[PDB]
DNA sequence: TGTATGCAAATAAGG
DNA sequence: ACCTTATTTGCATAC
């Protein structure tokens, strides 16, 4: 429930730093503990209660565990120019075909997947511009 | 050097 | 497969 997490977040911040652990370590420690590591950003945000109640309830355990006991694909950096060609392409055809997508990943040196996702995100951005 | 944060990739859930 | 939709999560960078 509410306060329960309110506190856990706090005591966790104390114990963590006292034990000589940066959010950076804490994140990556869970890496060699569960598979998916957590960037410093997520750790910081969890401490500052800067996350959704659900995400907060989801993360408490994982962390809480780590605390006492101790006592995902890499983000593709879409470059400015590729982002442009992508935008150009989108302006011509919003919902590209699988093969078309493949064709683009081919001409733009990047993984096919990063493109399908971009086209889905773009269609989402588009909705926020024209409901 | 550690920590905060804005933008946007990537994801989970359900067709 | 692969979509929409809502949300989770990390890069990059300025305190």
Swiss-Prot record:
DNA-binding feature ranges: 72-130
Post-translational modification: Phosphorylated by PRKDC.
Tissue note: Ubiquitous. Isoform 2 is lymphocyte-specific.
Domain POU-specific residues, every copy: 1-71
Location of the protein in the cell: Nucleus
Modified residues (Phosphoserine): 77
Function description: Transcription factor that binds to the octamer motif (5'-ATTTGCAT-3') and activates the promoters of the genes for some small nuclear RNAs (snRNA) and of genes such as those for histone H2B and immunoglobulins. Modulates transcription transactivation by NR3C1, AR and PGR.
Complex formation: Interacts with POU2AF1; the interaction increases POU2F1 transactivation activity. Interacts with NR3C1, AR, PGR and HCFC1.
Family listed: Belongs to the POU transcription factor family. Class-2 subfamily.
Name of this protein: POU domain, class 2, transcription factor 1
Organism: Homo sapiens
Lineage, opening ranks: Eukaryota, Metazoa, Chordata, Craniata, Vertebrata
Shown stretch of the complete protein: 284 to 439 of 743
């Amino acid at each position: 429930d509410l306060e329960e997490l309110e506190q856990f977040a706090k005591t966790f911040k104390q114990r963590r730093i006292k034990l000589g652990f940066t959010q950076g370590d804490v994140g990556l420690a869970m890496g060699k503990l569960y598979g998916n590591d957590f960037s410093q950003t997520t750790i910081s945000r969890f401490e500052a209660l800067n996350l959704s109640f659900k995400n907060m309830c989801k993360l408490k355990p994982l962390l809480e565990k780590w605390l006492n006991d101790a006592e995902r694909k890499k983000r593709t950096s879409i470059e400015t120019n590729i982002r442009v060609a992508l935008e150009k392409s989108f302006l011509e055809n919003q919902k590209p075909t699988s093969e078309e997508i493949t064709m683009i990943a081919d001409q733009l040196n990047m993984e096919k997947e990063v493109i399908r996702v971009w086209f889905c995100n773009r269609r989402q951005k588009e909705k926020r511009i024209n409901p």
